[PDB]
Structures are given as C-alpha cells and as structure tokens.
A paper describes a structure:
In eukaryotes and in some bacteria Ft is made-up of 24 subunits that naturally self-assemble to form a nanocage structure. H chains exert ferroxidase activity and have a high affinity for the TfR1 transferrin receptor, over-expressed on the surface of different cancer cell lines. Homopolymeric Fts constituted by human H chains (hHFt) are considered very promising nanosystems for drug delivery.
The SDS-based disassembly/reassembly protocol was used to encapsulate the metal compound Ru1 within the human H-ferritin using a 200:1 metal complex to hHFt cage molar ratio. Since CD spectra cannot provide indication on the correct cage reassembly of the Ru1-hHFt system, the X-ray structure of this system was also solved. Notably, analysis of the electron-density map reveals that the Ru complex is not directly coordinated to the protein, neither on the inner shell nor in the outer shell, as observed when another Ru complex has been encapsulated within the horse spleen ferritin nanocage. To confirm the presence of the Ru complex within the Ru1-loaded hHFt system, crystals of Ru1-loaded hHFt and of hHFtSDS were dissolved and analysed spectrophotometrically. The UV-vis spectrum of Ru1-hHFt from dissolved crystals shows a small band between 300 and 350 nm, observed also in the spectrum of the protein treated with the Ru compound in solution, but not found in the spectrum of hHFt. This result unambiguously demonstrates that crystals of Ru1-hHFt obtained upon the SDS-based encapsulation protocol and used for the structural determination contained the metal compound. Notably, the spectrum of dissolved Ru1-hHFt crystals does not show signals between 400 and 450 nm. The origin of this difference in the spectra is unclear, but it suggests a modification of the Ru compound structure inside the hHFt crystal, that alters its absorption properties.
Residue numbers in the entry:
A (entry chain AAA), B (entry chain AAA), C (entry chain AAA), D (entry chain AAA), E (entry chain AAA), F (entry chain AAA): 3 to 176
C-alpha cells in the first residue's frame, strides 16, 4: 500500500495512463514486426521494406522501455497487459503497409496528446516536458515521413505497379 | 490457397509448431522485460540484475525473429497470436526472479524438444539441424547459467540476506 | 577388393549415393555456366545476370569438390560419369532462367534429402551431419533467394518488359 | 539422491556412457603421451614424431575436458575411473606407432558411434548434436590423416628404411 | 535464323570448331579433377600432386570460359555437349598421371593447331591472334613442364620407388 | 639389454624412482582435474575455483612431461603405470578441496625429498640439481599458497559460510 519514497506530484491517473501508453508502444512494436516479415515472404520479396519496418519495430520497443523507466523514476508501478496481435496477417502491398503505419502512428500520437492533456490537468510539468521532449516531435517526424512515402508510392503508380514498389524499395528505403 | 514456390519437405504441422514457438519466444522476451524493470524500482534498486534481464529479453526477441525468418525461408506463413502478460508483476527478490527465469528457460527447452520430435517424425532434417544449431545448445547454456546463479544466491543467504543479492549484483552480474 | 584402412560405418549404398550426388553437383555447375553465357550474348546483354549465374556455377563446382573430399575421407572410391549437357541452349529471358534455376535447386535439394534418408537408414550420423552442415541450409537459402528473384521479376512485368529485366540486373544483381 | 535443477531429457544411461567416454579420451591422451616420449629416446631420436604425438596427446585431454563440461551442463555427475597404462612400452618404429594411432582413433570413433546410437535411442537431440559437432568429424579427419601417414611411410619403405622415417619426420611432420 | 548484329568475317565452320574446343577444354578440366582426387585417396596420399592437378583443372575451366566469351564476342552461338568422363578411374602412380597429363596437353595442342589452320584457311586474323595470344604458348609451356616432371620422376626411380614420388611431391610440387 | 650410449652415472634405482615420480605427477594432475570440474557443477558453481584447479592440473602434467624428458636425457627408459582415480568424487566445499590440495602437494614434496635422498646416496649431482631447480622450490611455493588459501577461507567462516567461498572465489582466485 504505502507510498514510494521518490513519488512527488505524480497523480494515480497519470501512473495508469503511463501503463496504458507502455502497452500501446509494445503493440506498435508488434505491428511493425508483423509488417517487416510480410516483406520477407518469397511472394513479396521487398528487402528494404522489411528492413525499414524492422527498424520501426525496434524503435517502438525503445519507446516502451523509456516509459517503463519513467514509471519507476516517478515512483509509479508498472502494470503490464497482453500485447494484442496486429489487426492484419496480410498487409497486401508496400503502399497498404505504409498507409497502415501512417494510421498506427497517428493513433499513437492521439494517445500521447491525451496523455499530455491529463498531465496538464494534474499540473505535472515534469511529465509534460517528458512527453514533449521524447515523444511529440518524434511522432510528428514519423507521421510526416510516412505521409511522404505514401505520396511517392501513389504518384509512382502503386499498388498496381509492382515496378513502383520495387524502385521505391531501392531508391527511398535502400 | 496455392503452394509457395519455395516450399519443399515442410509439413503443415511443422509450420504450425513454428508459429507456436514464435509466440513462446515473444512471451519469454516479455517475461524478461518485466523482470528487468522490477530491478529498476527505487525499492529494489539492483541495476545489474536489471541489465542482465534486459539483455535476456533482447536475446528472446532475436530468437523469435530467427524463427520468423525460418518460416519464410521454408515457404510457411507466419501467424501471430497475442503475447500474454507475464504470470507475475512482483518478482519478490533477485533469487526468486532467477528461479522463475530457470523455470521459463526449461519450459522453452521442453517446447523446442517437442518441436524437434515433430521435425524428426516428419523426416525434416533441415528443421532438425536448424533447431539443434540455433536453439538446443543455447537453451542448455542458458539453463546451466541460471542454475549456477540460483546456487550462488542460495549459498550466499538470499533471499533473506539483502547483502547477498547486493554483492551478487556487483560481482557476478557487474 | 580389400577394404580401405580408414573406412568405418560407411555403407556401400552411401558410397554409391555420394558418387551420384557428385555428378548432380557437376551437372548443376554446367547448367549455371550455360545460363551465364546466354546473358553475355550481344542480343541478351544483361551483364549482372551473366555474373550472378557464373558465381552460381563456381559454387556448384565447390559443392562437387567437397563431396569428392568426403568420399576419400570416409574411404569410399570416387566413380565419375559423363556430365550431361543442360536441357536448354536458349533460356529465353532473365525470368525464365531464374525459374529454371529455382527448379534446378529444388531438384538438387530433393536429391540431398534422399541422401540424408539413406544415411539415416544406415545409421551414419557423420554423413547426416555432413549433409546438414554443408548442404541443406545452403539449398534452403538458394531456393529462397531464387524465389525472391522470380517474384520481383514477375511483379516488375517480366518477361514482356525488357525494362524490368534491365532494372533488375542493375538494382538487385548489380 | 534428488535431481539436478538443470537436468532435462538426460537419460541415466547417457550420463553413464558420457563417463565411459571421458575415460577413453583420457586413455587416448595417455597412449599418445607414451608414443611421444618413445620418439624422444636417444636410440629413436625422431623429434617431429615426438612433437606430433605430444600435440595429439594434448588434443585428447581437451576432448576429455569438453565431455566433463557437457556432463555438468546437462546436470549429470562425473565419475572417474583409473586411466589404464597403454598396451605398449616399445612402439618399435614410426610406422608401427602411426598404425597403432590409426587403430586407437578407429576404436575411439566406434565408441562415439555407440554413444550417438544411445543418444538417438533416448531421443536426446542436444547430445546427438554435441557428438556430431565436436567429435564425429574430428575423428573422420584424424583417421584420414593417420591413414595418409601410414600410406606414405609404407610407400617410402618403412619400417626397414630408417632413411624413410627420417625424411618423413622432416618433410611431413616438420 | 537472322545474323548477329556483331558478326563479321566469322565463318560457320570456325563457330562450330570453337564449340568443339569448348567441349575439349571442359573435358581436360574433368580429367585433371579426377587425377587430383586420386592423389587425395588415403592409399595414395600425395597432397601436392592433388593440389597441382586441382590447379590444372581450374585453369582448363578458365580456358573454356574464355572460348565461350570469344564465341559471343564474334556473334557465334555456344552449343554445349556432354562432358565425357575421363578414360581412367585409377591413375596408378604419380608418374603415370603425369604421363597421362602430357598426353592430354599434346592432344589439346593438336586440336588448337587444327583450329588455327581452319582460321588461317578462312582468313580470320582476329581468331588466329586469339589462339596464338591465349592458347598456343600456354600449351607449349604446359607440355614442357609436364615433360620436365615426367623426366625427373623417371630419373628418381618412379613408379617402383614410392620414395621418389614422395620426395618429388615435396620438392617440386611443394 | 645393452646400455644406452648416453647413460653415465645414472643408477638403476634412480631410473625406477623417476618412473614412480612420473606416475605421482600424473596422479596429481588427475586429482586437480577432478577438483576443477566439481566447482563447475551447477550445485557448486564457483568458476574461479574451477579455473584455479584446472591450471594446477595442467602444471602437474608439465611436471610429469619434464620428468619423462629427464628419463630420456639420462638414457633411462620410461615405464608407465595406471593413473589411479582420485580418492574423492565429492570434494564437499572450497575449503575442503584446498585442504586436500595442500595434503596432495605435501605428499608430492615428500616423494621428491625421498628422490633427492636417493640421488644424494648414489652421488648423482645432475639429478640432485634437476630436482632442486625444477621441483623443490615449486613445491615450497605451492604449499605456502595453499596454506594461505586455507587460512583465509577458515578466517572468512568457510565452509558453513557460502558467502565466504563466493567472495574468496571473486577476490583471491578472480
Ligand atoms: Cl504524488
Ligand atoms: Cl493521486
Ligand atoms: Cl534496429
Ligand atoms: Cl503544469
Ligand atoms: Cl525529436
Ligand atoms: Cl520532418
Ligand atoms: Cl524536426
Ligand atoms: Cl532506376
Ligand atoms: Cl512441402
Ligand atoms: Cl503437409
Ligand atoms: Cl541487449
Ligand atoms: Cl530426418
Ligand atoms: Cl550454441
Ligand atoms: Cl555452460
Ligand atoms: Cl557449450
Ligand atoms: Cl564400413
Ligand atoms: Cl556395406
Ligand atoms: Cl565465383
Ligand atoms: Cl544415425
Ligand atoms: Cl548454411
Ligand atoms: Cl534466406
Ligand atoms: Cl540462414
Ligand atoms: Cl532428465
Ligand atoms: Cl533416466
Ligand atoms: Cl599441444
Ligand atoms: Cl532425437
Ligand atoms: Cl570438425
Ligand atoms: Cl581430411
Ligand atoms: Cl572436413
Ligand atoms: Cl560473318
Ligand atoms: Cl559462313
Ligand atoms: Cl586454382
Ligand atoms: Cl588471315
Ligand atoms: Cl603465354
Ligand atoms: Cl617453359
Ligand atoms: Cl615462354
Ligand atoms: Cl650409468
Ligand atoms: Cl646401476
Ligand atoms: Cl593452464
Ligand atoms: Cl653428489
Ligand atoms: Cl622455483
Ligand atoms: Cl611464496
Ligand atoms: Cl620463491
Ligand atoms: Fe512509439
Ligand atoms: Fe528463446
Ligand atoms: Fe568486492
Ligand atoms: Fe550444389
Ligand atoms: Fe578424442
Ligand atoms: Fe586448356
Ligand atoms: Fe607436481
Ligand atoms: Mg491500449
Ligand atoms: Mg517510427
Ligand atoms: Mg500504487
Ligand atoms: Mg484477439
Ligand atoms: Mg491498415
Ligand atoms: Mg525536442
Ligand atoms: Mg528520443
Ligand atoms: Mg504457446
Ligand atoms: Mg537467455
Ligand atoms: Mg498455408
Ligand atoms: Mg490473461
Ligand atoms: Mg516463477
Ligand atoms: Mg552448435
Ligand atoms: Mg545463435
Ligand atoms: Mg544423376
Ligand atoms: Mg547456388
Ligand atoms: Mg569399393
Ligand atoms: Mg544427351
Ligand atoms: Mg527450365
Ligand atoms: Mg540428427
Ligand atoms: Mg548450419
Ligand atoms: Mg559451406
Ligand atoms: Mg572404457
Ligand atoms: Mg587426434
Ligand atoms: Mg545421479
Ligand atoms: Mg593393468
Ligand atoms: Mg598397436
Ligand atoms: Mg561440423
Ligand atoms: Mg572442436
Ligand atoms: Mg571433342
Ligand atoms: Mg595446364
Ligand atoms: Mg547460327
Ligand atoms: Mg561413355
Ligand atoms: Mg593415360
Ligand atoms: Mg604471347
Ligand atoms: Mg592467358
Ligand atoms: Mg606411486
Ligand atoms: Mg601446483
Ligand atoms: Mg634398463
Ligand atoms: Mg582402485
Ligand atoms: Mg582430502
Ligand atoms: Mg647440493
Ligand atoms: Mg631455483
Ligand atoms: Mg620450472
């Protein structure tokens, strides 16, 4: 029951919201892992799409670990939940995977914006600064990058043009 | 429906057993992640226990990735399931965590031995060699290491001796 | 007549099966040599297809040499047969050559799997280990690579698109 | 009485067979030590024969140590027996010593093949892989090398030609 | 049917004669491969004879490849035939193998001299220069080397003297 | 029967005493090998005790080899006997093993002192110098080191204190 010796200005609602965000980052890690190995299939065979999404996957795990570190720094207690399987097994195309990644990153951003609103409501400037420093601009850059990629693949003629996804794999992701 | 152009001598039962093993490796990764951050709590504060279990966690993710690579190499299709949360939130002590890790690694080994029996039953010598090369001796070394650690912590007087877990953290894990 | 001073646990059927496999590896070497120089024709002119298949050809010769070394290591006696000319003089296209190479590598794999079954039947664990160590995973990687290449060429629009085979030559094989 | 915390899938018969093999490797070490110092006698005086057999002797000790390490890795218990003196004090000639070494290495190989059959019978794929990885191909190479040496010494005119054993000592073992 | 865009002054008889020579070079490659592994037998065991003939074998493959390159350079079309097994399985002795290699190299030279006569008859100075530059002096050097080796082995007392072949292996081929 | 051409001032009793000492050094090597792998057990798990005794074991083998070299230098003839298994399978504790090693080294020293008395009685100053140079001060240093180790382990509270043996392993043997 008794309070952590380190805990100060750290609301129970913020503690719970941080545990929810840890789960979402691990979910995103899992989604990108699934997408990566789709592109390693012998009937898809786009190795730089596979490498790009595997790197994305490793970055999400790092995002989760930093939130776990934060939870302990502030004297909250980590509570883990199941990591749900991704919505899709078959990602259809390079373009569709990039569109799904854009959607994932905007949903993660919306979660972080809700987290920041809560930290603002509870007058937790350390937690506001943590989210702003480590997460919000990373999300803005990730979303911009994925939008750029979706744009190029559409302009090149994906997903009908297998030549488009092949040349994008070599010139943008390679 | 139609068969992968690469698939040869790769039974549907082996394909399914590989997907089950991918889930178990990701589960083990999650268990070690949970254990790691327990030792980063301000009321536990054993930083080399935390580092040791985080490294274990990263190794399990690599074990899962190599099985995903194998699935595609042989022309099977990855099917992911939810990654269950670990059995414990509170791991009690350095000794208890090490005993739980020993139990986890023996359960993963038993799964791999069942997988090898199936590959033997289906006359899949490539899959037998894959399991023997990349997994069986890694498990034997992991189990031996964890047994050694449990032995030292017990002999030192853990878990009642907080001095024992502190000195083990510095001299064996540091 | 009299037995080799080194021979131990090496069945006459295994000895004969090794000589058959030596011939098949030299045949595969010859098939890839033929394919290589097709791409060096002035009316085909895909230099990285030519280089890729020449390297394949040199690797098959190395596969044959290692089996010849094995035969002598175990005290069997090499018996050579004619190396048959390849089935084709004209390989039609980059895509068709890659499809023929995939077929060749799956036939060589099937031969090696029959060889392993025989070594298992004759309780020859050294020969089983030799095949697993030096051949089975090399075949699995070769087949996966060729499947990936066939997939990309088809998606790019080969064989009708001469642009597809030209750009594949530069970006994947170059 | 109670079971090792590490032990899994490790039959008592395999444990005993490993202890027998440890003794045989130490015996082989002793045989090669005896042979080495025969060639250091002032009335034999073949220094590269002496060096060759001393290196052989050190390799057998390493073979024994790795089996001792395996016994503990799998949670079996080492049981040592007397190391019998070699069959001979006087090895007669370079050729006779090489013929005795060929016989020793084939007997050690036969022991390892019996060990592998037992591990196969007890469905111990880790132990099968251990024997295949560390022992079976080392034996095949050792036996082939000794056969080659016996062949050269016989062709040169040993053991009647002291010139043959002298020139072999310099050109093959030196 | 229609003519290569590159073809100029290249008679159909020269084109056919080049295909015959490609087969003979691949045959010679095969003969030297067979001879090499004879010397790797445990009951022959002359490792520098084995290395010498393996290098010879690799040089013949290079001779064949350069003729394949020539065929395409001049706009002819490669036509491959079966590579016949060597005349012998058992080469008897170092001296006999060297005598067989001398005979092989003189037969290859006679083929090249017939090829040059044809190129002269068809007023093909490029093909005459190609044969003179890349083949005729290589044959003269190869034949002289093999004659020197046969001479030394005979003078040393081969094939009855196993000491002769052993010392030649070390001092000339080593 | 007839005498070695090198033999001078080398009594048959000294020759026999040297063969007895060769056996005792090989016995000591075996005792330290057994002790080493006791500390590699998963239920003992003191890796620097294991390393220390393995090094001791290798030093005893070197002691035996130097006596074998001496036997031949002086024109005596090596006669080997069985190497008896150690008195213990289970060495109980770090302290007990160190006490057993102290006892072993004092027994080996007593043997060497008897050997020196015999060499003195037979007026063999070369053999006296050999024993003094290579053995007597090595024994005195070994005995002093083991006494120091026994003293520290007792003062630290071994064998009841598992913490004592763990910290000794790290700070003295590590
Ligand atoms: Cl608070
Ligand atoms: Cl609160
Ligand atoms: Cl990464
Ligand atoms: Cl605030
Ligand atoms: Cl940023
Ligand atoms: Cl940006
Ligand atoms: Cl920015
Ligand atoms: Cl391009
Ligand atoms: Cl299949
Ligand atoms: Cl199936
Ligand atoms: Cl790591
Ligand atoms: Cl099988
Ligand atoms: Cl391993
Ligand atoms: Cl280990
Ligand atoms: Cl190991
Ligand atoms: Cl046999
Ligand atoms: Cl047979
Ligand atoms: Cl190459
Ligand atoms: Cl078997
Ligand atoms: Cl491989
Ligand atoms: Cl691969
Ligand atoms: Cl691989
Ligand atoms: Cl068991
Ligand atoms: Cl049992
Ligand atoms: Cl050595
Ligand atoms: Cl098995
Ligand atoms: Cl090996
Ligand atoms: Cl070999
Ligand atoms: Cl080898
Ligand atoms: Cl023309
Ligand atoms: Cl013409
Ligand atoms: Cl070469
Ligand atoms: Cl002319
Ligand atoms: Cl030249
Ligand atoms: Cl010359
Ligand atoms: Cl010249
Ligand atoms: Cl004397
Ligand atoms: Cl005397
Ligand atoms: Cl050492
Ligand atoms: Cl004296
Ligand atoms: Cl000293
Ligand atoms: Cl001292
Ligand atoms: Cl001193
Ligand atoms: Fe994230
Ligand atoms: Fe794992
Ligand atoms: Fe300390
Ligand atoms: Fe091959
Ligand atoms: Fe051995
Ligand atoms: Fe040639
Ligand atoms: Fe000693
Ligand atoms: Mg959620
Ligand atoms: Mg990202
Ligand atoms: Mg709480
Ligand atoms: Mg669900
Ligand atoms: Mg989507
Ligand atoms: Mg910033
Ligand atoms: Mg950052
Ligand atoms: Mg499961
Ligand atoms: Mg691990
Ligand atoms: Mg399916
Ligand atoms: Mg649940
Ligand atoms: Mg537990
Ligand atoms: Mg291994
Ligand atoms: Mg590995
Ligand atoms: Mg065939
Ligand atoms: Mg290949
Ligand atoms: Mg035969
Ligand atoms: Mg035909
Ligand atoms: Mg085909
Ligand atoms: Mg096997
Ligand atoms: Mg392998
Ligand atoms: Mg290889
Ligand atoms: Mg025995
Ligand atoms: Mg050896
Ligand atoms: Mg027992
Ligand atoms: Mg006896
Ligand atoms: Mg003998
Ligand atoms: Mg191997
Ligand atoms: Mg080894
Ligand atoms: Mg011909
Ligand atoms: Mg030549
Ligand atoms: Mg034509
Ligand atoms: Mg014929
Ligand atoms: Mg001939
Ligand atoms: Mg010239
Ligand atoms: Mg040249
Ligand atoms: Mg004694
Ligand atoms: Mg000592
Ligand atoms: Mg005597
Ligand atoms: Mg006894
Ligand atoms: Mg004792
Ligand atoms: Mg004195
Ligand atoms: Mg001194
Ligand atoms: Mg000394």
């Amino acid at each position: 029951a008794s309070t952590s010796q380190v805990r100060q200005n750290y609301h129970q609602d913020s503690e719970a919201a941080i545990n929810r965000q840890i789960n979402l980052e691990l979910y995103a890690s899992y989604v990108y892992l699934s997408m990566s190995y789709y592109f390693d299939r012998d009937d898809v065979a786009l190795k730089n799409f596979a490498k790009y999404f595997l790197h994305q996957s490793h970055e999400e795990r790092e995002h989760a670990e930093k939130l776990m570190k934060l939870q302990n720094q502030r004297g909250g207690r980590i509570f883990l939940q199941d990591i749900k399987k991704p919505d899709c097994d078959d990602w259809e195309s390079g373009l569709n995977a990039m569109e799904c990644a854009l959607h994932l990153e905007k949903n993660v951003n919306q979660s972080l914006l809700e987290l920041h609103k809560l930290a603002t409501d509870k007058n937790d400037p350390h937690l506001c600064d943590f989210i702003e420093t480590h997460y919000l601009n990373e999300q803005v850059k990730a979303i911009k990058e994925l939008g750029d990629h979706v744009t190029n693949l559409r302009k090149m003629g994906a997903p009908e043009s297998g030549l488009a996804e092949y040349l994008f794999d070599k010139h943008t992701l390679g």
